[PDB]
């Protein structure tokens, strides 16, 4: 086991299969697809190569009643290693459509197999967000007192992608899109800035509603959670101070440069104008030669 | 009324148009908007000898309009013209304002009065008297942070202690001197911050400069195509 995993990058193919698998097993809500996750780990970069389905039946009358095909897993692990050896058991996906408190009973079964802590990929399968609907959680074990002595909990890690030559081009090939998660050109970064503001408002409601539910729908007072919230307010900017003033001076510098840079562009655009009128100048001499040839051609027409 | 179009109008008609605009605003006490037009009107007019007369008219007007707004027009522009002899009384107006000397401005407008009346700059000159005085006291405020209003009276040869107060008092309503008068500590003390780099002002300047620049980029783009289209219609290889 290792807790050294700071990012998870997931191939397009892993996402696409697990999602694809949900309707190939023809499961609907409250029945689960789970599959084996194969890839690299023991490193900071997790690189998620492939995945394959398992059968999974969930009974939720008792969360101690579960179906898992044990034998299937061992068999399949060995065959995959003969195509490519870099495939190891690095976890299992859960098909969502939300997190539970119940995913921890299941996680224990996968610690058994592995030499890293199993990655629990909650792939939300109706697909909500203008971002990815894929969460990564790795079970981390640390001594902590919040009413417990030793806690196993799941820490979120970022989900992003990485792709091969072949795989990237195959994505692009499906897509008729030019992307907009890129943050390349001016146009693209404009779109992004507005998406960022909308991302921020929606999360703030989720924080605002959570707090209404303690105090009026009576969940318990969780010191540890609030504690974290408190610091948000403590590390706020405060204006009407010289700090606010340094910003004003900053604005001036950048907008000056935009003007001076723009004035360069006023020469560029204007210079070109003269060059076209040169091309128009040349085209009239050429058209004159044509007009002479065509004078002669008309006499032939009369003649014949 | 608003119906003055820009759609196909000749450059002769626009040029005259802007000259009139400059005159109309200045007599009714707006100077801000008269600047833009008096400059525009020189630019649309061409710079020939048969047109020189029109340029002499514009150049005389450019002195009044500019000065009343409270910016001194180029000494240089009138110096290095051929029109220098026509704008000889007018050079002498600009120098009077610059130095702040009342006596000088009064002397000028007496001697050349017959010329000034024809061009219809003279009515504007009665108002330009006001500009001379503010400059004389403006000068004293920049040099001298603390000087007793007693000393200010001697220097510009004003009548009493009450006189000196009321010019300076109006100057600061419009903010031109920008000072504070102390009558119970017996001096005028300048309150000049005199920095504009740690103001939100540069933002406001750069906006004009950028909008003008983009304006021209579009004007290059639109114009460029039309001859290209015509040569294409005509037969050529």
Curated annotation (Swiss-Prot), chain A:
Residues annotated as signal peptide: none
Keyword Phosphoprotein tagged: yes
One Gene Ontology term, aspect cellular component: proteasome regulatory particle, lid subcomplex
Entry keyword annotation includes Phosphoprotein: yes
Single GO biological process annotation from the record: proteasome-mediated ubiquitin-dependent protein catabolic process
Modified residues (N-acetylserine): 2
GO molecular function: metallopeptidase activity
Pfam families for the chain: JAB, MitMem_reg
Alphabetized UniProt keyword annotations: Acetylation, Phosphoprotein, Proteasome
Family: Belongs to the peptidase M67A family.
Primary role: Acts as a regulatory subunit of the 26S proteasome which is involved in the ATP-dependent degradation of ubiquitinated proteins.
Matches recorded under PANTHER family: 26S PROTEASOME NON-ATPASE REGULATORY SUBUNIT 7, EUKARYOTIC TRANSLATION INITIATION FACTOR 3 SUBUNIT F-RELATED
The name this protein goes by in its record: 26S proteasome regulatory subunit RPN8
Species of origin: Saccharomyces cerevisiae (strain ATCC 204508 / S288c) (Baker's yeast)
From Swiss-Prot, chain B:
Protein task: Acts as a regulatory subunit of the 26S proteasome which is involved in the ATP-dependent degradation of ubiquitinated proteins.
SS bonds (residue pairs): none
Parent sequence residues shown: 256 to 492 of 523
Other remarks on this protein: Present with 16700 molecules/cell in log phase SD medium.
The protein's assembly and partners: The 26S proteasome is composed of a core protease, known as the 20S proteasome, capped at one or both ends by the 19S regulatory complex (RC). The RC is composed of at least 18 different subunits in two subcomplexes, the base and the lid, which form the portions proximal and distal to the 20S proteolytic core, respectively.
Gene that produces this protein: RPN3
Entry coiled-coil feature ranges: none
Phosphoserine, modified sites: 199
Compositional bias annotation for Basic and acidic residues: 225-237
Family: Belongs to the proteasome subunit S3 family.
PCI domain residues: 15-195
Protein name: 26S proteasome regulatory subunit RPN3
Native source organism of the sequence: Saccharomyces cerevisiae (strain ATCC 204508 / S288c)
Spans through the membrane: none
Maturation and modification: N-acetylated by NAT1.
